[PDB]
């Protein structure tokens, strides 16, 4: 946990601003070079993480910290099928949590009383969340916005993707987005290949 | 005007049972009146924007709508208070009694139809939340309505959400289509079947959320052909429950339906039933 | 683009003006529409019962306004979702609905009920946008799209022929054809990995000049004004952005969706020497 | 090769009513007053017929089925045209 300042979770472990608050409250148009650098750092960090047979079970845009251009990935050993638990009114769904789940995980249970662990996590399902991160970092906002949970669940379970009405670039970035969100698990790429794909610059400056 | 200082604390049906509400008796002239605990974490910039959208909630004095007394903020929560009803809601009565006979169902349908027609005709507000959990019954025999979506910004800024094992959405709603008045009819018909039989009918007489949300869209809509009812009731539910929105009648053409006219011309003792079911 | 054209805030004057071009047999209803002050929000949610309150006692006169309203709603609400996957949704959903209904009915020794023919007609009607978009510019220079078009057209032809030919039983045949249609729709939804099926159409502004731009409009039965046979003269495509398959929706900042072809040509030829239009260009790529 | 149903006029509609469903001869004048052209013949709905004045259930069902058959028969003439265009 040294090469990309990976954090294992006030003289150390300092906390501050993150990527989510940056891109949302600041509303600053990130440069293309900064986008490429951040994506490369995230891909390298996750590829290093995947090499130690430990699965990052919760990747969002609030679990990344940027300080002077150095990326930091945190909280990769907490989430599970038990951490979420709510009353008899049904499952308590956070506001922006249902758009980061791959189709194989979106089949959650309603009665909030599952024996054991309902979900099953694999490295194949983790790369799906990287696609949403890149989409929101290149476009400017989330996916499936202004929709209820009972609609997002069914739309994602059918194997859908948000229509690319806000992106203006070449075919490479859209091809990568389609690669990440593939319906079948085995046909998804791996971070070793994705790092090579992103390394070949689609554009410069 | 309204402030949290002059509101007291009274007895409640339960602690944490479903949502949290708390009866309040005003010190001044003893205004018995309920409260709604709504909790949000929003920056003050949009707080005023939400606040400006509750005046339309008070500028509507139809008989078949619960009154609105005011709204105020107190320590991280938005407080909205409405007239207290000593009867309860159709959910609790359904759980205790077991079902509802035909005449009470007809009177309730008439009341909700009139309320929806008034709201749509006067302010063009689409309910979008119609279920047996949003119909309040008094003790004299009245029927009211509450919790209708007026401010869309509150939905966009809601802190959490819940799903539950019972859903009342429309097949067009689950496919990303917009919200229209025709969506309310499907939910109202589903509620009518629910109170007619006694249980949620979508699983024919458990399993994940997706297996329900995809059973609603594809499988044929439920019907009440398995028991002896009034025929007009069956045709009313049939008209209400149809997959394609264009085949679903608008509220202005079920008000002339034979079942609604028969209900209007009759007279049934609602007060006796509601008094008997509850604790006097 | 979006700022110029809105439908939920239309003043009653704009609703009155747009209705005028629908037909020449609705000149007398403009005053009544103006009296009640029917805005865009009420216009988009018009229903048969309401139309009888403005003296429209004729069903045939109601149908034209209903069609124009439906077209306007489709253009406005789903402008930014009109992509290949969205059209593939209805092709699949209706087929699965019909299949499940047939399986649940389990009918035997009975003729095809009129409801079944109604669903079959609804299903084939959903094929039209898909094939209409597939054979146009984005997907006409590749073999895979042509093969998919041929397969779906063969399935639709079997669907229609089996139903129309004779009555019952063809029920297993129609069920199997529905299953094939559903499978092909699922394949276009999920398996195909090209990024074109995600991008929808887009809006654009075009200026044209006393030269008569010779784009002969070939209006279909739905009133969709599609430009065809652009003249080979250099200035037409050098100064203009028009191309085959382009669709015209606005003339001089005035919506014409769902009109009749006669007035569109009349308006264009009677327009000013300098004209401004709005074109719904087919999907492309900004390769920079 | 009949003409396209989208281009039909009223006279064609009464001719169609005379030929295909001439048994129910007491309802033909209804199509005249309500101006049922070719375009409106396609999208006529059961509610629309009920409004128009087909009180009896059986006659309304028969007319519904006849119009449905006509609409299905005109659907083939579009699929074949699009197939021919695809083959080119
Ligand atoms: C995802 C989704 O469908 N969201 C959605 C969609 C439409 C509606 C609502 N909605 C809701 O459900 N509630 C109930 C649950 C408490 C509200 O109270 C509620 C509410 N307040 C309210 C209004 C009137 C009365 I008289 C009492 C009240 F309390 N106002 C002002 C709203 O405009 C919304 C946002 C509400 C929520
Ligand atoms: N003014 C009121 N009069 C009577 N009962 C009330 C009033 N306000 C709230 N309640 C009751 O308070 C309880 C909790 O309500 P709440 O959680 O807001 O909605 P709900 O209908 O119970 N559930 P849901 O359908 O999931 O939103 C219900 O039993 C209501 O009937
Ligand atoms: Mg409530």
Numbering used by the authors:
A (entry chain D): 731 to 739, 752 to 947
B (entry chain C): 81 to 285, 310 to 384
C (entry chain B): 0 to 167, 170 to 210, 213 to 291
D (entry chain A): 19 to 106
What did the study's authors say about this model?
Similar to KSR, the protein Connector eNhancer of KSR (CNK) was identified by genetic means in Drosophila as a key regulatory component of the RAS–ERK pathway. In flies, CNK, like KSR, acts at a step between RAS and RAF to facilitate RAF activation, but its precise mechanism of action remains unresolved. Notably, the N-terminal part of CNK (denoted CNKNT) encompassing the SAM, CRIC and PDZ domains and a 260-residue linker preceding the PH domain can recruit the KSR–MEK complex in a manner dependent on its physical association with the SAM-domain-containing protein hyphen (HYP; also known as Aveugle). Here we show that the fly scaffold proteins CNK and HYP stabilize the KSR–MEK interaction, which in turn enhances RAF–KSR heterodimerization and RAF activation.
To visualize the binding mode of KSR–MEK to CNK–HYP, we pursued an atomic structure of the minimal KSR–MEK–CNK–HYP complex in the presence of AMPPNP and the MEK inhibitor trametinib by cryogenic electron microscopy (cryo-EM). The resultant structure, determined to 3.3 Å resolution, revealed unambiguous Coulomb potential density for the entire CNK–HYP subcomplex, all of MEK including bound AMPPNP and trametinib with the exception of helix α1, and all of KSR kinase domain with the exception of the N-lobe. Disorder of the N-lobe of KSR correlated with the absence of ligand in the kinase active site. Aside from the apparent disorder of the KSR N-lobe, the binding mode of KSR to MEK is similar to that observed for the isolated KSR–MEK structure, with a small 3° pivot of the KSR C-lobe with respect to MEK that eliminates potential for steric clash with CNKCRIC. The activation segments of KSR and MEK adopt similar inactive-like conformations stabilized by an intermolecular antiparallel β-sheet as previously observed. The binding surface on CNK–HYP for KSR–MEK is composed of all three domains of CNK (SAM, CRIC and PDZ), whereas HYP makes no direct contact with KSR–MEK. The largest contact is made between CNK and KSR (765 Å2 buried surface area) and involves the αG–αH linker and helix αH of KSR and helices α1 and α4 of CNKCRIC and the CNKCRIC–CNKPDZ linker. The second largest contact is made between CNKCRIC and MEK (719 Å2 buried surface area) and involves helices α1 and α2 of CNKCRIC and the αG–αH and the αH–αI linkers of MEK. The third largest contact is made between CNKSAM and MEK (330 Å2 buried surface area) and involves the α3–α4 linker, helix α4 and helix α5 of CNKSAM and the APE motif-αF linker, αH–αI linker and helix αI of MEK. Our cryo-EM structure reveals an extensive interaction of CNK–HYP with both KSR and MEK kinase domains, suggesting that CNK–HYP stabilizes the interaction between KSR and MEK.
